[PDB]
Write a protein that binds this ligand. Sequence first.
Ligand code: ZN
Ligand code: ZN
Lengths: 134, 114, 147, 108, 195, 134, 87
Amino acid sequence: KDILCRLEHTTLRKVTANTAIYYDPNPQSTVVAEDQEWVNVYYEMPDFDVARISPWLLRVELDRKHMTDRKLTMEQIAEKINAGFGDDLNCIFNDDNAEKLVLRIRIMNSDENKMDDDVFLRCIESNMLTDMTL
Amino acid sequence: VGIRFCQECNNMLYPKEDKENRILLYACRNCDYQQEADNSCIYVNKITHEVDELTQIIADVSQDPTLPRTEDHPCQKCGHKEAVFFQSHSARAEDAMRLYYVCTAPHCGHRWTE
Amino acid sequence: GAKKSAIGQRIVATLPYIKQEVPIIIVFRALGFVSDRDILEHIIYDFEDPEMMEMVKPSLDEAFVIQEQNVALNFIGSRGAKPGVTKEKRIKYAKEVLQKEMLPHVGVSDFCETKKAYFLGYMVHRLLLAALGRRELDDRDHYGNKR
Amino acid sequence: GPSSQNVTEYVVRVPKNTTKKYNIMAFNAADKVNFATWNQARLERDLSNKPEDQPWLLRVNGKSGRKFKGIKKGGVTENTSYYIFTQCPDGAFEAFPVHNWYNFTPLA
Amino acid sequence: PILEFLEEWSMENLEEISPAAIADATKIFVNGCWVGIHKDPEQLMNTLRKLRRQMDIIVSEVSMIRDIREREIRIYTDAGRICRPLLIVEKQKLLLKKRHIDQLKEREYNNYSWQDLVASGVVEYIDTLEEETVMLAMTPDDLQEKEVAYCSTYTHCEIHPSMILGVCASIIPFPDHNQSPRNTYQSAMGKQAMG
Amino acid sequence: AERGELDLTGAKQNTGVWLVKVPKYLSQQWAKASGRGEVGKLRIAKTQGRTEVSFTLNEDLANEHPFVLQSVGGQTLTVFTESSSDKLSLEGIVVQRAECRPAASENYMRLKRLQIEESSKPVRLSQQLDKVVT
Amino acid sequence: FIQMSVQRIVEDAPPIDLQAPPRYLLKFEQIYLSKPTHWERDGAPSPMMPNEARLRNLTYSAPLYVDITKTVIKEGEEQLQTQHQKT
Ligand SMILES: [Zn+2]
Ligand SMILES: [Zn+2]
């Protein structure tokens, strides 16, 4: 089964439960109360993103059963996103203890510091769901 | 999720942030109109989409003569013994064998699942 | 594509005597329903459901450029099988096409625009239901569907 | 009081001919049409076709206010008729046939 | 006549309705044209069925279909629709009675005929679309008799199942005992048989 | 004050009017004379929490019509008149809608059949001649 | 077909308008159909039995006639309407 998992094809679309593009202008005060519990953990000592953050946010919730079936934990997904998009995107993911697997995404700090700050998120989310390979 | 229409020309309102105040405004196009976006969530899609089929079920199906009728599942709302049970038979379910029950008593369109 | 998969999937219409398809919202605009609310009133009969509302967003975005009935009629005429020498003639030709060539069974008189718009919205509604999986796709081999 | 059991019955009158024809003006609910701001209005036959067989154009409060377009109901009432009951000092209802039906939609 | 009757009854024309009302109401289509909407689809269908079975304002071949789930009522009158006669079943009982059978037995010298059955509303023509919504009983003596309740809402009963066969397949004796391609082969051969 | 001006005095007074859908037999009975100034009497009986509307056909005209009300909240309706003097005016706003239904159920279908035959009279059919033209 | 469609097709056929000044209008009103007939070489019509048609290789056909009204407007303020019965 390990070889079968390593051979078959799995896309963020397969391991993602849902996606939502929130505004969330202030990361410290997240629009999502559930997020605010653990997002503040990362934003208490933020690194590589204190300079600037794009106002928009892309929240993706991942299916626990699919994640366990493909042996895909919360780490390598963010690592793959980082490798694919360079520093273009900042990814902050919750812990497996939480019943909901959440991965907030924002655009790079430099661009914030041309297409669209909003529609570009729809572009990346759909390409991540289909084109990207986990 | 909500869709807002311009009050001036009744056109679709698209989301735009205002850098001056850093708040979401549903701004009209070809109209030069703006509104304050209270909901905040502009887009959301559920891939799993565990939609409650009871919402799709229509109480009028109790009048269908071709649907099976069982008296072993009385209606909770009114206690009526007779009820009509059927499968979803709706695509995207990818597992459709459970039975949805609808009360056969007129004026009581109660629907449930076991 | 970046924007291709961002907007989603859009609805077009292959009208008769028109070489290439046109966006459905453009057809509605030509029929004379300009406001997105008016068009969506004829397409979606229950605004409470957001799932069907999201389905029509790409079509509205694609047809956003055209906002006037005459503009939509000229757009259709420019793609008519017999291009009009002038814009007024193109409009006169597109109006004739939408009056007698599209949905003739609904009506061919001059004042059948509302009926045709309602029926076209019903067609779009059926397409949206099929896409959403709320209705089973029609079976070609079914005989009630044969004469 | 008398309101809980009031019974009202009125005569019905149908004059053979009326100087002013009666039509129906229908506005969509979502448009939120309000007559308080209707200080002035202009209803006239359209000029796009360039008369009795053409749609109607309404311009409320001149160019500043909203513009609506009315189209005759294509479906004829070969088996139906519409009548309007209006209060009058004599206390008898008066019925007038609907010559035409018009659905007006605002123009941005 | 169908459109006139629908207008007479509480069917709101499309032009004279706000779109918001379309949600709850059931659409009314005639020959593929969306004529209007109605609020009491069950009562409308009952009235239409009664009219068709009485041959008053609806002819026999007109087919009325109520898609309850889709909230639609499609009335079809155009030609080319294939339909067959079926006995009407109400309250698990045939409307065909011994009086009808006796009048048919005396078919001649009394003017009684099949048209009289159709007018009496004991047997009505069903097309494929309406047959989707019909609850057929193969035979009255077995399927709608008081027994293990497989179904107690039968709407029609087959006159005789053998009527599913064609002219050439109807001359095969005991065709239900033959492997089907042999029935097909005999259907082919009967057209080449001498006589 | 101009030719195209609409007299909104009816709207200002908020005059309420009732719209009714009535059958052709009733309308034609009214049209028969149409000049006697009388066609019937509309009787409305109200109870503690229920109101019924009915119309009685004139005895002379005949030689019961219950009324069913309809909600008008889904669409706003107004009545306007085009005077022969080219002075458009508004009569009032529709506040209630009603439908008139026949009392007879079966025997009424006989009159409906007679109407259908009358309407079919103009329909022309191919005629079987006997004796070739010469 | 014979009873409804032929007559309806003739009725629905638009009136023929001609002008090139006087103008002529042709309208087809009514359809008439006689029994199947066969014309001998001498020109005498006679009813054609189906067996006779089968034996003589004839076509079992019925003559078709239309009532045609021709109205001519000469621009002289008088229009002349002449009806040709069973053309
Ligand atoms: Zn606007
Ligand atoms: Zn119940």
